Amino acid sequence: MDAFQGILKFFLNQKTVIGYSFMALLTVGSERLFSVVAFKCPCSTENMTYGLVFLFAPAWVLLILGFFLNNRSWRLFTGCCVNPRKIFPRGHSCRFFYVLGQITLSSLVAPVMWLSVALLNGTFYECAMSGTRSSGLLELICKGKPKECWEELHKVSCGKTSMLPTVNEELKLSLQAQSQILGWCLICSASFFSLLTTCYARCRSKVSYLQLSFWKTYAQKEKEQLENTFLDYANKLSERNLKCFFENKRPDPFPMPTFAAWEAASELHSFHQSQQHYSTLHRVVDNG
Amino acid sequence: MDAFQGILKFFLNQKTVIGYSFMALLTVGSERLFSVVAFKCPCSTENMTYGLVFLFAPAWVLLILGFFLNNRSWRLFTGCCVNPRKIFPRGHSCRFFYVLGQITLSSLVAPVMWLSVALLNGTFYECAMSGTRSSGLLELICKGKPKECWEELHKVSCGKTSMLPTVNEELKLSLQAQSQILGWCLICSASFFSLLTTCYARCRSKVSYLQLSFWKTYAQKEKEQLENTFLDYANKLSERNLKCFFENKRPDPFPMPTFAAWEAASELHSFHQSQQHYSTLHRVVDNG
Amino acid sequence: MDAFQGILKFFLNQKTVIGYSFMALLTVGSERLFSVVAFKCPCSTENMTYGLVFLFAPAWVLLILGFFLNNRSWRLFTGCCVNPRKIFPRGHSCRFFYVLGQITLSSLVAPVMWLSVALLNGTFYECAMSGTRSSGLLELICKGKPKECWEELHKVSCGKTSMLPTVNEELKLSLQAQSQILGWCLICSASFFSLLTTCYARCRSKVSYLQLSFWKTYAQKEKEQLENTFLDYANKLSERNLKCFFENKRPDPFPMPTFAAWEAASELHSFHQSQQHYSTLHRVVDNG
Amino acid sequence: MDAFQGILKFFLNQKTVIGYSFMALLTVGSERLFSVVAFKCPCSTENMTYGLVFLFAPAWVLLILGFFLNNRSWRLFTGCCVNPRKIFPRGHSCRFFYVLGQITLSSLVAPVMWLSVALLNGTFYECAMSGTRSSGLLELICKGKPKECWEELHKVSCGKTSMLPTVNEELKLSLQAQSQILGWCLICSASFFSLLTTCYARCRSKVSYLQLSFWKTYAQKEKEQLENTFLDYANKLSERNLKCFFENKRPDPFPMPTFAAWEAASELHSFHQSQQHYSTLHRVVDNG
């Protein structure tokens, strides 16, 4: 009875850590299927292009897919060209870049978690670094190797090289270990940067921790009560419009908010501690 | 009890992302059945025609199938030739191309997801590029290859070539990697174009985000109340016609909307912020 | 009936020892997957960097992840730059370092439990100590070994050495046993330090054991009653704001605490035995 | 019906013998995983240090872990430095060492049960005794053995010895049998010492067997009544503090015990047969 109503409280409270644990568990299973089934490195001069597309192009698709599912990116841009000065208020001319910077950093999580799993499985970097064709970065790999390392390097993945094939097995291990070092430098420097910008946004907040816990509770059920007021006023408007069509009647007037009140309740909210309002709908009711 | 009435809320809300995830999971399993069971490349002079038909003809079938299932393409064209000026209003003469462009771009999703999975499995491009017979694009494939690369290229898929059969294994890998580069160029440039036209359509909207959320709620249950009014007036009309046939009576008059009211409620809706009407049935009731 | 209501009492009472037993059971299964599936030591001159990154970089990620999930690190830092003297009171100028020292030692548990399991499975230390290149610490390993121990030491993991390959099997055992001795010195000296600072914090407490048991019961259900007062005052504020918007009314006044009362209830609590208060909200009510 | 309410009486009554049977079943399964999966003896000069750490370091961790889980070690030390003379009463100046001696001997059970199972599986002692390097205790092992027993003894675990390898099988059996004799001498002398100090503490008791059975029944449900009086007085204090914050009222006074009564009920109890009190809370109520 109460055993099932006591575990769902502890699960719904920790809901922002199972969403990230599921986003990281799907990238691991998707990277162990692109390299096993679809990736096979050609031993040609297109080595640099072929390995640099299986690395960065699945990270570009996940960036655009995070702008589609972000519900507060359509809340900001819808109706922009009607009056472009309602997103740029004259009192706070810099909150547009704070919100737009919050959309970008929130959708960079899945590109970063793709570039780290793909670098901790060093099959894409080994195919890409073999076709380097550069003066620098080639003496580092071919340090104590024979004279034909500077030309037959881009064949080391397929074997197929007349260079005593146990040097080909220790030229693969030197490239499969330069990517796993780079794969850990990306997790360590993106976790530190994600904590440095989160703590700076909370240290510079306008309210303390107790008022911020009421602000999040009000903003979560102002949207639940909005879905029930829209759904109740739409059942009464469609019943008025369908009885005056089949019976050829004249309708009673239907009171609705005007266009000036619809656009004034859609502006961007910024907290003021002199008159403490918790939403932009709270501000237009208390002022009018 | 309430655990089953709390997961279906989170599933029906995210309903436009499981439909596209099911459309992408069916194209993958359909492309891995044509190339395994039905496709076998002939090593002939019909190499170009055979591989270019398994690429573009299953994408032409899915384009027409997206016009049959689009419910707002029959809402626009039914009764066109009675009065063609009800689709071309004189106030807004350009909305006909906005609606027609929305039909085309919404049915181009499944052709694009076919050409990407087919190019990421490079069996159709390798059979097609072998029979190119062109001056350009033939020196790129036969760069460091012997003299009989310019004539025996169209046999490389079947083997069957007296050209030292390890060059035939590195001419297959060079063609199976030019299609996977081209496959990622299509996903990366169609995901960017799909976001550029969706964001431009919302930035140029007439209403803000809050009024657009009531417009979508009213339009969803105006169709639900329309199906219950049609089903209620058809049960009363069929009972009147059947009692006056078997008993040879004369019927009472049945009030129904006239022909001029049926055609006025079927026009194309366009929002005006001076008189805010949320449908074209709402406009003919409030005006008459 | 009462059999299920008698074991959940004994499980929820011992709740701080199943969270640590689950934190230690997940580190063991995560370390037996990095060394088996992903770690393969190269026999090169990058031996020192490769083995020292698989040791300390997964312990840097778990340190930052313990600052995110700590609920009393945001309770201290939110709203810091509005008035920085509310975290540094003039009466108790040193409690800021007692709370900050409690956040750090509580999040150092999972880094320490990573470095112990990684040293009791001596694969990361064997790859890293082989590339030592130092005057000291090299005569200890190469004590009764031949002359080529001082140059071909970094190849001992891959084999591949012309040094009579049964000396290569007793040079691996001498390095796989110097890490397991260091793995037990870390558990034995972190368990003694975790008891010395816990017993010193309780011996220097202001209240005895009986008053401290009431303090923990009050602080546990002041948070439960706070979540039900926030959820009740937010259902009444959103109902007031949505009836005055759709009907264009003027609202009744809504009594709420002022901004000066919100910030005084968010300060840092310190016990005084002259006037015994159990929270900072209890102190501002009894004083005003 | 009553079949389940008649076996749980016989199980909860014998609760101090299933806790020790489960503590001993976990040490056996934990010692058969260290010596099988993680222990591999090097044949080097670090034989003494390697085998003496796998023996005594898991016994030092279990000693500190028995101070953390002992609920009457925090009952004694919390608030010690406020007034140190409440743990050292002038009438009974030696009860502090009786309680501290009861904490130490009750947490030595799991260290002793580790050293006995680890010595009845003679793998740790065989690795450590091979590197003895002593004048005594080496003639006992090398009694009827050849001349190279005094130098090649520390290699006997790995084999690897040119000493007619059937003498290497009877030097392992002589060291794997000196530890099992030492393993049984530890269980025989710790079971006799545990009965000798338990019977001496009960023979020197102040009450007889019948009064001691009421004392254990009262002390067991003074703690159950204390958890319900704390949980009832904390629900009334948090409701008073939250209604005077959101409504800006002034509160009624809340009667609570003073600081002098909180510390007098936290002292150390000792029985007196002149005025028979069964707790230290029973003493301060009957006296005041």
In this structure, the number of other CB atoms found within 10 A of the CB of residue D123 comes to 21
- CA distance linking residue D53 with residue C238, whole number of Å: 65
Please report, as a single letter, which amino acid is at residue A124.
Answer: F
Contact C180, C122 (CB under 8 A): yes
* Partner residue facing C234 (CB), from A166, A192, A217: A217
Please report, as a single letter, which amino acid is at residue D184.
Answer: W
In angstroms, what CA-CA distances link C31 with C156, C165, C175, C284, D7? 23, 29, 19, 50, 43
- CA distance linking residue B23 with residue B29, whole number of Å: 10
Q: Do B278 and A237 touch (CB under 8 A)?
A: yes
- CA distance linking residue C183 with residue C167, whole number of Å: 25
Whether C204 and chain D come into contact, CB under 8 Å, resolves to yes
Whether C203 and chain D come into contact, CB under 8 Å, resolves to yes
- Token digits of residue B285: 């009731």
Mutate: best of A32, A139, A211, partner C, most C CBs <10 A? A211
Q: Do C173 and D42 touch (CB under 8 A)?
A: yes
Residue C47, annotated ligand binder? no
- Token digits of residue A108: 């960079």
- CA distance linking residue B249 with residue B241, whole number of Å: 10
**Closest approach of C280 to chain A, Cα-based (Å):** 12
Q: Do A61 and B282 touch (CB under 8 A)?
A: no
Residue D32, annotated ligand binder? yes
Please report, as a single letter, which amino acid is at residue D160.
Answer: K
* Touch of C by A (3+ CB pairs closer than 8 Å): yes
Whether A5 and chain B come into contact, CB under 8 Å, resolves to no
- CA distance linking residue B272 with residue B206, whole number of Å: 8
DSSP state of C34: I
In angstroms, what CA-CA distances link C179 with B19, C36, C183? 54, 18, 6
Residue D85 — left, alpha, or beta (φ > 0 → left; ψ -120 to 50 → alpha)? alpha
The helix (run of H) or strand (run of E) holding residue A22 is helix A18-33
In angstroms, what CA-CA distances link C277 with C184, C253, C262? 45, 33, 18
| Neighbouring residues of D105: CB distance < 8 A, sequence distance ≥ 6 | D197
Residue A222 — left, alpha, or beta (φ > 0 → left; ψ -120 to 50 → alpha)? alpha
- CA distance linking residue C42 with residue A174, whole number of Å: 6
Closest CA to C271 of C92, C94, C103: C92
* Partner residue facing A202 (CB), from C40, C77, C256: C77
Question: Roughly what angle, to the nearest 10 degrees, separates helices A109-117 and A53-68?
Answer: 160
- CA distance linking residue B181 with residue B173, whole number of Å: 13
Contact C129, C178 (CB under 8 A): yes
SS3 of D113-172? HHHHHHHCCCCHHHHHHHCCCCCCCCCCCCCCCCHHHCCCHHHCCCCCCCCCCCHHHHCH
Maximal C-alpha separation, chain C: 96
- Token digits of residue D175: 């060291």
Q: SS3 of B176, please?
A: coil
**Distance from the Cα of residue D84 to its chain's centroid:** 26
- CA distance linking residue D267 with residue D285, whole number of Å: 14
- CA distance linking residue C40 with residue C127, whole number of Å: 9
In angstroms, what CA-CA distances link B5 with B274, D7, D134? 41, 41, 77
Chain B residues with CB inside 8 Å of A49's CB?
181
Chain A residues with CB inside 8 Å of B3's CB?
4, 8
Strands (E), chain D: none
**Closest approach of B13 to chain A, Cα-based (Å):** 12
Whether C272 and chain D come into contact, CB under 8 Å, resolves to no
- CA distance linking residue D143 with residue D161, whole number of Å: 18
- CA distance linking residue C225 with residue C230, whole number of Å: 9
Contact C38, A120 (CB under 8 A): yes
Chains with 3+ CB–CB pairs under 8 A to C are A, D
Write phi, then psi, for B77 (nearest 5 degrees): -100, -10
Instruction: Give C232: exposed, middle or buried? Use CB within 10 Å, 0-12, 13-18, 19+.
Output: exposed
Q: SS3 of D183, please?
A: helix
* Minimum CA–CA partner of C173 in chain D: D42
In this structure, the number of other CB atoms found within 10 A of the CB of residue D150 comes to 13
Instruction: Give C40: exposed, middle or buried? Use CB within 10 Å, 0-12, 13-18, 19+.
Output: middle
Buried b (16+ CB within 10 A) or exposed e, A216-247: ebbeeebeebbeebbeebbeebbebbbebbee
- CA distance linking residue A38 with residue C70, whole number of Å: 42
This structure was determined by: cryo-EM
Pairs across A and B, CB distance < 8 A:
147
Strands (E), D54-111: none
Whether B272 and chain A come into contact, CB under 8 Å, resolves to no
- CA distance linking residue D120 with residue D184, whole number of Å: 8
Chain D residues with CB inside 8 Å of C211's CB?
262-263, 266
Closest CA to C176 of C215, C118, C121: C121
**Closest approach of C203 to chain A, Cα-based (Å):** 31
**Distance from the Cα of residue D2 to its chain's centroid:** 37
* Minimum CA–CA partner of D245 in chain C: C285
Contact D237, C283 (CB under 8 A): no
Residue A190 — left, alpha, or beta (φ > 0 → left; ψ -120 to 50 → alpha)? alpha
Residue C90, annotated ligand binder? no
Question: Count of alpha carbons within 13 Å of B6, Cβ hemisphere only?
Answer: 5
Q: Which residues 105-164 of A are in CB contact (within 8 Å) with B?
A: 158, 160
Each as own residue / partner, the long-range contacts of residues B187-196 (CB below 8 Å, 24 or more positions apart, any chain) are B187/A57, B187/A61, B187/B116, B188/A57, B188/A60, B188/A61, B190/B112, B191/A60, B191/A61, B191/A64, B191/A65, B192/A64, B194/B105, B195/A64, B195/A67, B195/A68
Buried b (16+ CB within 10 A) or exposed e, D190-208: beeeeeeeeeeeeeeeeee
Contact C261, C200 (CB under 8 A): no
Contact A276, A208 (CB under 8 A): no
- CA distance linking residue A250 with residue A236, whole number of Å: 16
- CA distance linking residue A161 with residue A157, whole number of Å: 10
Residue B37, annotated ligand binder? yes
**Distance from the Cα of residue D185 to its chain's centroid:** 20
Helical ranges in chain B per DSSP H? 8-13, 18-33, 47-68, 71-77, 95-106, 109-119, 124-130, 178-203, 209-246, 259-264, 280-287
The helix (run of H) or strand (run of E) holding residue D97 is helix D95-106
Residue C223, annotated ligand binder? no
- CA distance linking residue C130 with residue C51, whole number of Å: 10
* Partner residue facing B188 (CB), from A57, A245, A263: A57
The helix (run of H) or strand (run of E) holding residue C218 is helix C209-246
Question: Roughly what angle, to the nearest 10 degrees, separates helices B280-287 and A209-246?
Answer: 60
DSSP state of D3: T
Chain C residues with CB inside 8 Å of A143's CB?
45
In angstroms, what CA-CA distances link C250 with A255, B19, C253? 16, 45, 10
Q: Which residues 78-97 of C are in CB contact (within 8 Å) with A?
A: 78-82
Whether A230 and chain C come into contact, CB under 8 Å, resolves to no
* Partner residue facing A262 (CB), from B166, B188, B211: B211
Q: Do A181 and C259 touch (CB under 8 A)?
A: no
- CA distance linking residue A68 with residue A89, whole number of Å: 26
Q: SS3 of A84, please?
A: coil
Closest CA to C53 of A188, D56, D61, D256: A188
**Closest approach of C77 to chain A, Cα-based (Å):** 6
Write phi, then psi, for C205 (nearest 5 degrees): -70, 160
Angle at D94 between CA D90 and CA D96, to 5 degrees: 100
- CA distance linking residue D230 with residue A167, whole number of Å: 74
Residue C136 — left, alpha, or beta (φ > 0 → left; ψ -120 to 50 → alpha)? beta
**Closest approach of C116 to chain A, Cα-based (Å):** 20
Whether B229 and chain A come into contact, CB under 8 Å, resolves to yes
Chain A residues with CB inside 8 Å of C160's CB?
166, 170
* Partner residue facing A241 (CB), from B17, B192, B285: B285
- CA distance linking residue A48 with residue A30, whole number of Å: 22
DSSP state of B45: S
Q: How many helical (H) and strand (E) elements, i.e. helices and strands, does chain D have? A: 14, 0
Whether C199 and chain D come into contact, CB under 8 Å, resolves to yes
**Closest approach of C75 to chain A, Cα-based (Å):** 6
- Token digits of residue B248: 């040879």
* Touch of D by C (3+ CB pairs closer than 8 Å): yes
Contact A23, A114 (CB under 8 A): no
Closest CA to B184 of B119, B275, B259: B119
Q: SS3 of D5, please?
A: coil
Contact B199, A77 (CB under 8 A): yes
* Minimum CA–CA partner of C169 in chain D: D42
In this structure, the number of other CB atoms found within 10 A of the CB of residue A257 comes to 17
Contact D176, D118 (CB under 8 A): no
- CA distance linking residue D256 with residue C277, whole number of Å: 11
Q: SS3 of D270, please?
A: coil
- Token digits of residue A182: 């780079």
In this structure, the number of other CB atoms found within 10 A of the CB of residue B49 comes to 11
**Distance from the Cα of residue C49 to its chain's centroid:** 26
Q: What Rg do the C-alpha atoms of chain D give, in angstroms? A: 29
Pairs across A and C, CB distance < 8 A:
145
* Minimum CA–CA partner of B274 in chain A: A259
- CA distance linking residue D117 with residue D187, whole number of Å: 10
Q: Do C173 and D43 touch (CB under 8 A)?
A: yes
**Closest approach of C155 to chain A, Cα-based (Å):** 11
- Token digits of residue B107: 């049915």
Question: Count of alpha carbons within 13 Å of D205, Cβ hemisphere only?
Answer: 14
Write phi, then psi, for C250 (nearest 5 degrees): -110, 135
- CA distance linking residue C196 with residue D67, whole number of Å: 11
Q: SS3 of D241, please?
A: helix
DSSP state of D83: -
Contact A17, C69 (CB under 8 A): yes
Sign of CA dihedral D6, D12, D18, D22: positive
Contact C176, C120 (CB under 8 A): no
Closest CA to B254 of B281, B227, B226, B235: B235
- CA distance linking residue C213 with residue C205, whole number of Å: 13
Chain A residues with CB inside 8 Å of B257's CB?
245-246, 248
**Distance from the Cα of residue B283 to its chain's centroid:** 31
Length of chain D: 288
Tokens 């049915």 -> residue? B107
Contact D248, C286 (CB under 8 A): no
In this structure, the number of other CB atoms found within 10 A of the CB of residue C122 comes to 24
**Closest approach of A12 to chain C, Cα-based (Å):** 14
Closest CA to A222 of A283, A287, A288: A283
Angle at A260 between CA A254 and CA A265, to 5 degrees: 100
Chains with 3+ CB–CB pairs under 8 A to A are B, C
* Touch of D by A (3+ CB pairs closer than 8 Å): no
- CA distance linking residue D173 with residue D178, whole number of Å: 9
How far from each other are the two terminal CA atoms of chain B, in whole angstroms?
A: 49
Mutate: best of A12, A114, A262, A282, partner B, most B CBs <10 A? A262
| Neighbouring residues of D264: CB distance < 8 A, sequence distance ≥ 6 | D284
Mutate: best of D262, D279, D281, partner C, most C CBs <10 A? D262
In angstroms, what CA-CA distances link C210 with B165, C12, C166, D67? 87, 21, 65, 20
Length of chain B: 288
Question: Roughly what angle, to the nearest 10 degrees, separates helices B109-119 and B47-68?
Answer: 150
SS3 of chain A? CCCCCCCHHHHHHCCCCHHHHHHHHHHHHHHHHHHHHHCCCCCCCCHHHHHCHHHHHHHHHHHHHHHHCCHHHHHHHCCCCCCCCCCCCCCCCCHHHHHHHHHHHHCCHHHHHHHHHCCCCCHHHHHHHHCCCCCCCCCCCCCCCCHHHCCCHHHCCCCCCCCCCCCCCCCCCCCCCHHHHHHHHHHHHHHHHHHHHHHHHHHCCCCCHHHHHHHHHHHHHHHHHHHHHHHHHHHHHHHHHHHHHHCCCCCCCCCCCCHHHHHHCCCCCCCCCCCCCCCHHHHHHHHC
Residue D83, annotated ligand binder? no
- CA distance linking residue D155 with residue D43, whole number of Å: 5
Whether C22 and chain A come into contact, CB under 8 Å, resolves to no
- CA distance linking residue C255 with residue C253, whole number of Å: 6
Q: SS3 of D57, please?
A: helix
